[PDB]
Structure formats: C-alpha cells, structure tokens
Amino acid sequence: LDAKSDVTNQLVDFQWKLGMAVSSDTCRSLKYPYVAVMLKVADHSGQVKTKCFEMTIPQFQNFYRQFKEIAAVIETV
C-alpha cells in the first residue's frame, strides 16, 4: 500500500443543485439565487467522505474562470 499518485485526496464524484431562497423568519422576501455542491472524496485509507458547501453566482463564475485558467496552464505545459 504505497502509491505516489495519491498523496492527500482524490474526489470520486461531483454533484450539484440549483435553487433560490424564498423566505425566512427575519425576512419574507429574501429571494436571492444560490448554487450548492456536494463532494465525496477518498483518502489513502480507501474510505469515502462527504463534504457539501453552498456558493453564490459571482463566486461560482469565479470558480469556473479559475478552473478554465488552470486547464489552459496545465495544457500548455
């Protein structure tokens, strides 16, 4: 059980959802869009975790742009 390819983590699946918050106890017209993500990741033990977090539209587009730049840079060399 020793492999260089896996050092820290490697996500095995990627799921997401799109929804918007309509109302809240402190505000009846909250009404803002949001986007969530669920990551299940595997460590050296061979197990599978589950990490989920929520984002906004500007944060999501920043995420997408950064991954695009990463793809370009990795492709070039």
Binding site: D2, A3, K4, V7, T8, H44, V73, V77
Partner: protein, 198 residues
C-alpha cells in the same frame, strides 16, 4: 500470581500427560506470548484435550509464562544456570526436558522481544515525489523545485483504543529545510562514525 514458589513447581508436576512434544512446544510458544487473544487458545486446548477445569490451565500458564519470561530476561544460555532454579524433589526427567526445550529456542524469544518494546510511533515505509511549481494563482509562471515526503506510521493498538490506527502523512518541503535536515543528519552520522572509530 505467586512468586517462584513450591506451588508453581508442584503444580508443574502434571506436564508428562502429553505423548507428543509438538503440543509441548505449542504451549511453550504461546505461553511466552501471554495476551488475551493468545491465552484463550491455550484455555481451549487445555480444557478440550486434557479434560481439566480452568484453574488447572490458568495456574499452569502462570508458571510456564513466568519461567519463559524469567529465562529470557536473565539470558541463561547455559543449561546449569537453569538447573539452579529447581528443587531436588521436582521431577528431574521433566527438569531436563524443560532445560533442553528452553535452550533450543532461546534466540527466538530474545529477538522477538526487541520488536515489542514500548516506543513512539515507528516508521515502516516512506515514499517521495519531487515536483515543480510551474504556475499559481498569484503568479502566472515559474519553475521552482519542491519535495513531497510521504510516510507510514504504526501506533500501538492499546494507546489509541480498539483500532489499529495506521496513518499516513505528507510534508511539502523546500530547498533550505532539506539542506538543514541533511546537514543535521550528516552531523549525526559523522558523530556515530567517530564513536565507532574511537
């Protein structure tokens, strides 16, 4: 439970009931390794074969384990040294048998003990993978060496609960830290060599 008393030795006047020495050697090699998992097999073997209760097995295990531990602790490599530990009236036809059994297999116990010494978690395996940092978010490009040392650790099951608790770690180094590491380790190696040659 007791010390090296007549209780143990007189209780040891029951070991001739076996016909084959293989059972004797199995008992010898499982009593020296006293533990909850390793004791239960002795309990089952004795109760099933010798048709005795639990006390006759437990006290006999106590005696045999204590004898093995004592001889390993003292490193009694001469048969006459073991002869000093017995009374005259205790069975000599069994005393000589025990002496020969102990003498034949001493090195196994002497060596296997050193692998069970208490200690901090011990390395068992490592791997490394040099990497180059071509680009990052805060800088478009570079070419910088980097190291990724990965290691394996085995901790005693007792100190963590019921788990084996074997963990893996990864540390990302740079040039200066590696240089300091190597200088210190080379200094230690030079000290060891000087001691050897002195």
């Amino acid at each position: 439970m007791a010390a090296l008393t007549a209780e143990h030795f007189a209780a040891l006047q029951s070991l001739l009931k076996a016909s084959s020495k293989d059972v004797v050697r199995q008992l010898c090699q499982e009593s020296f390794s006293s533990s909850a998992l390793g004791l239960k097999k002795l309990l089952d073997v004795t109760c099933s074969s010798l048709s005795v209760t639990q006390e006759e097995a437990e006290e006999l295990l106590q005696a045999l384990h204590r004898l093995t531990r004592l001889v390993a602790f003292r490193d009694l490599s001469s048969a006459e040294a073991i002869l000093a530990l017995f009374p005259e009236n205790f069975h000599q036809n069994l005393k000589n048998l025990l002496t020969k059994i102990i003498l034949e297999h001493v090195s196994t116990w002497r060596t296997e003990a050193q692998a069970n010494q208490i200690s901090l978690p011990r390395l068992v395996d490592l791997d490394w993978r040099v990497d180059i940092k071509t680009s990052s978010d805060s800088i478009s490009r570079m070419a910088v060496p980097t190291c990724l040392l990965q290691m394996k650790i085995q901790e005693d099951p007792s100190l963590c609960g019921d788990k084996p608790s074997i963990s893996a770690v990864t540390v990302e180094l740079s040039k200066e830290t590696l240089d300091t590491m190597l200088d210190g380790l080379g200094r230690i190696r030079d000290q060891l060599s000087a001691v050897a040659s002195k």
